[PDB]
Design a protein around this ligand. Sequence first.
Ligand SMILES: Nc1c(C(=O)O)cc(O)c2c1C(=O)c1ccccc1C2=O
Ligand SMILES: [Cl-]
Length: 260
Amino acid sequence: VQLNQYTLKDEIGKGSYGVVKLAYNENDNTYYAMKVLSKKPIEQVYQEIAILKKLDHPNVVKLVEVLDDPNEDHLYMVFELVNQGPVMEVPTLKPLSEDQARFYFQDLIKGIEYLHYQKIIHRDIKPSNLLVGEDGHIKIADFGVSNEFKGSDALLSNTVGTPAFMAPESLSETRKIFSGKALDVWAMGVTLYCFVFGQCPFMDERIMCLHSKIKSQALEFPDQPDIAEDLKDLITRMLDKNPESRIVVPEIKLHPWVTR
Ligand SMILES: Nc1c(C(=O)O)cc(O)c2c1C(=O)c1ccccc1C2=O
Ligand SMILES: [Cl-]
């Protein structure tokens, strides 16, 4: 499969958007990541593109170009390849060590801080959207449902993202307004829990029951593996069901588990 100067190779990532394939650029003899989307709506795609064009940070993916032809049903986004792929698969029987989780979590902090400063709410933070680059550091990927806001926070009403990572205030069935930055914090808390336990803190195959656990089930840590008390404190604060008292990113940065 040829696409101007790009030769499409095998699939390296996959999601609701479609697929991401390895692509070989014959102009510069270099590999890129090629996200392939089918027009089946389309305007959410160009919001993702508009957001990506504004982002330039070591812990965020880098959009290189967009190949859009009105005659073809497919649309192509070329990214710089983040060669080592997702930091982990969830669930897994081999979670990260605490020192490894801290290393990656420090990257996630920096990336989220940059995004929020650039007035973007990511809305789909999870380990499979955290890609490990050449130097071993994380880049945040997949802005497919991200929001841009004006002012100091987003005031939102729509429910998007990955269900196990959705914050409880986004799960009202009355279109209540909730603020955006704390949604990303919640998902960072689910992500950090996944780092060290290998599974999500709230789980159910029945979507109704999953929503109910996110909203109403108290967080429980497994007996094994035995994690540090300050890490438990940090996760507990990020998974505060009340967004008004949930820890904020400026405080996460200072948390004693993060800084030791
Ligand atoms: N989903 C994305 C995106 C995006 O949707 O924003 C951007 C990317 O650069 C990448 C990916 C990947 O899934 C991926 C999977 C395996 C190796 C590299 C990559 C990658 O580099
Ligand atoms: Cl995941």
